């Protein structure tokens, strides 16, 4: 037996969430629906223009680990915060969910990462992220025993922005594969894919990544195409398993020549799309590490995604395991 189902690795971030009108995005030159990297000065500027807000632990991979644990799986997380109040919040929330989290802060400065997330009337989220302490994540933060004892190690494409995180990920891939485990990544964001297109392709083609998560936008960006069918064919050729999400249109899981389409759950109303892809990965990787069929992994993904988009904030505040039991996915 193993000690963990899923280890995730990401930018440790606290979210600062507010609703805005569409004009706000245009006036502030915020790219809608994207992750927008910002410096400390821009962070202060945007915050001064933001309305009253709510705070919640975030980080894409963090959300994913929390979601695995909520479902009843065993999760761990690597990510670097600062020794400050935001970091203490971050540490509390993820450990409180029963996720193993032992990455040690290096000091108080730079401070813990935060993302100002603006939710428009259509439920879309536009993130503005100051990386702070996340720039310090490196190979020293790899808990080798944790990687070795985890069935799957999953990481963000977003980790390619800070300088040394990629080296930790390469160490992770080596360890995971030497112990017969699997590696997984999410493409994270279509602009992130654009920044690191060749690098991400090489991760898949060299076999460093076994399982890739993408949405439609990321897949189209990856192969620089308007043709979604081309994108699916190419992604299936480049990685062992691909899980591609398509919002209200559900998901498709690809493995060689196999394709498994999965319907999205019908929604009351889309409240806030923040976390949707993260929780799709929770559900998928929980199913995968429980030995479930690829279709059933996709079902568990879409269930968790559907739940998170019906609340404010990125981590479901209700029981995913209960929801899966009621859905017969157990
Ligand atoms: N650069 C980033 N790296 C990792 N996660 C991010 C980044 N910017 C925003 N997020 C997280 O994305 C989550 C939504 O997927 C939010 O909870 C937010 O914290
Ligand atoms: O075809 C492209 O080259 C392409 C496609 C999608 C993109 C999304 C964000 C940034 C750059 C992109 N570039």
From TrEMBL:
It holds the Pfam family PfkB. Adenosine binds at residues 11, 15, 59, 63, 129, 156, 158, 278. SUPFAM superfamilies: Ribokinase-like. One of its GO terms (molecular function) is kinase activity. ADP binds at residues 215, 245, 247, 250, 277, 302. Belongs to the carbohydrate kinase PfkB family. This is Probable sugar kinase protein.
């Amino acid at each position: 037996m193993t000690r963990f189902d899923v280890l995730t690795v990401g930018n440790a971030i606290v979210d600062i969430i507010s609703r805005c009108n569409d004009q706000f995005l245009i006036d502030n030159q915020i790219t809608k629906a994207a992750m927008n990297l910002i410096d400390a000065e821009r962070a202060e500027l945007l915050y001064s223009r933001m309305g009253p807000a709510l705070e919640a632990s975030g980080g894409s991979a963090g959300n994913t680990a929390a979601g695995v644990a909520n479902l009843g799986g065993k999760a761990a997380y690597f990510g670097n915060v600062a020794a400050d109040q935001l970091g203490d919040i971050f540490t509390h929330d993820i450990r409180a969910q029963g996720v193993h989290y032992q990455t040690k802060p290096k000091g108080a400065f730079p401070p813990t990462a935060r993302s100002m997330i603006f939710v428009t009337e259509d439920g879309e989220r536009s993130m503005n992220t100051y990386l702070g302490a996340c720039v310090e994540l490196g190979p020293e933060d790899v808990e080798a025993d944790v990687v070795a004892d985890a069935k799957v190690t999953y990481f963000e494409g977003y980790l390619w922005d800070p300088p040394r995180a990629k080296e930790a990920i390469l160490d992770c891939a080596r360890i995971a594969h030497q112990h017969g485990r699997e590696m997984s990544m999410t493409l994270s964001d279509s602009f992130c894919v654009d920044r690191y297109r060749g690098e991400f392709l090489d991760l898949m083609r060299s076999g460093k990544v076994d399982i890739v998560f993408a949405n439609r936008q990321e897949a189209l960006s990856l192969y620089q195409t308007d043709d979604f069918e081309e994108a699916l064919n190419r992604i299936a050729a480049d990685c062992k398993i691909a899980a591609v999400t398509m919002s209200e249109n559900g998901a498709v899981i690809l493995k060689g020549r196999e394709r498994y389409y999965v319907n999205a759950i019908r929604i009351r109303e889309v409240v806030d799309t923040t976390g949707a892809g993260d929780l799709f990965a929770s559900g998928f990787l929980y199913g995968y590490t429980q030995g479930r069929s690829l279709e059933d992994c996709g079902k568990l993904g879409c269930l968790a995604a559907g739940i998170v988009i019906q609340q404010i904030g990125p981590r479901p505040m209700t029981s995913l395991s209960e929801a899966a039991k009621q859905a017969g996915l157990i």
